[PDB]
Amino acid sequence: AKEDNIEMQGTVLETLPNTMFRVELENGHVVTAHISGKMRKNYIRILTGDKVTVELTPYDLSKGRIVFRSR
């Protein structure tokens, strides 16, 4: 409605500790992201350079998360 979270994704540049994504965004900046928890165990597998989603907030632009497969 007003301050909602946007899907606004990237290129995986690192696959981080367990299965996370140090992603270069569509805006040109590096963000830390995880996938959305749910699909991890129907394991929809990805590596260092895959087409990730990365949803983020209005306020905190340094982070993100693979919501639904959009790129």
PDB file of C-alpha atoms in Angstrom, residues 27-70:
ATOM      1  CA  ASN A  27      20.528  -0.862  -9.530  1.00  0.00           C
ATOM      2  CA  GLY A  28      24.413  -1.574  -9.757  1.00  0.00           C
ATOM      3  CA  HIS A  29      25.124  -2.102  -5.944  1.00  0.00           C
ATOM      4  CA  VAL A  30      26.307  -5.275  -3.987  1.00  0.00           C
ATOM      5  CA  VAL A  31      23.675  -6.780  -1.552  1.00  0.00           C
ATOM      6  CA  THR A  32      23.644  -9.771   0.929  1.00  0.00           C
ATOM      7  CA  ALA A  33      20.616 -12.127   0.280  1.00  0.00           C
ATOM      8  CA  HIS A  34      19.037 -15.523   1.184  1.00  0.00           C
ATOM      9  CA  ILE A  35      16.413 -17.441  -0.811  1.00  0.00           C
ATOM     10  CA  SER A  36      12.735 -17.469   0.628  1.00  0.00           C
ATOM     11  CA  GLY A  37      13.011 -20.541   3.061  1.00  0.00           C
ATOM     12  CA  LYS A  38      10.107 -22.550   1.496  1.00  0.00           C
ATOM     13  CA  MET A  39      11.636 -23.817  -1.860  1.00  0.00           C
ATOM     14  CA  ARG A  40      15.106 -24.671  -0.265  1.00  0.00           C
ATOM     15  CA  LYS A  41      13.811 -28.267   0.426  1.00  0.00           C
ATOM     16  CA  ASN A  42      12.170 -28.905  -2.936  1.00  0.00           C
ATOM     17  CA  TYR A  43      15.890 -27.876  -3.632  1.00  0.00           C
ATOM     18  CA  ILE A  44      15.681 -25.435  -6.547  1.00  0.00           C
ATOM     19  CA  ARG A  45      19.515 -25.352  -6.861  1.00  0.00           C
ATOM     20  CA  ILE A  46      21.687 -22.374  -7.825  1.00  0.00           C
ATOM     21  CA  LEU A  47      25.467 -21.536  -8.010  1.00  0.00           C
ATOM     22  CA  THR A  48      27.943 -18.528  -8.333  1.00  0.00           C
ATOM     23  CA  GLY A  49      26.404 -16.708 -11.394  1.00  0.00           C
ATOM     24  CA  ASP A  50      22.689 -17.784 -11.591  1.00  0.00           C
ATOM     25  CA  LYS A  51      19.416 -15.812 -12.198  1.00  0.00           C
ATOM     26  CA  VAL A  52      18.318 -14.995  -8.654  1.00  0.00           C
ATOM     27  CA  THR A  53      15.355 -12.917  -7.359  1.00  0.00           C
ATOM     28  CA  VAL A  54      16.281 -10.533  -4.472  1.00  0.00           C
ATOM     29  CA  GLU A  55      13.292  -8.738  -2.776  1.00  0.00           C
ATOM     30  CA  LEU A  56      14.318  -5.785  -0.487  1.00  0.00           C
ATOM     31  CA  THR A  57      12.856  -2.877   1.598  1.00  0.00           C
ATOM     32  CA  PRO A  58      12.309   0.958   1.032  1.00  0.00           C
ATOM     33  CA  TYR A  59      14.640   1.808   4.033  1.00  0.00           C
ATOM     34  CA  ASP A  60      17.407  -0.919   4.068  1.00  0.00           C
ATOM     35  CA  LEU A  61      18.923  -1.070   0.514  1.00  0.00           C
ATOM     36  CA  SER A  62      22.119  -3.124   1.528  1.00  0.00           C
ATOM     37  CA  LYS A  63      20.150  -6.521   1.812  1.00  0.00           C
ATOM     38  CA  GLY A  64      17.728  -8.836  -0.171  1.00  0.00           C
ATOM     39  CA  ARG A  65      15.964 -12.263  -0.744  1.00  0.00           C
ATOM     40  CA  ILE A  66      15.011 -14.683  -3.742  1.00  0.00           C
ATOM     41  CA  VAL A  67      11.158 -14.562  -3.434  1.00  0.00           C
ATOM     42  CA  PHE A  68       9.634 -16.146  -6.674  1.00  0.00           C
ATOM     43  CA  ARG A  69      11.765 -16.885  -9.872  1.00  0.00           C
ATOM     44  CA  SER A  70      11.553 -13.582 -11.935  1.00  0.00           C
TER      45      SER A  70
END
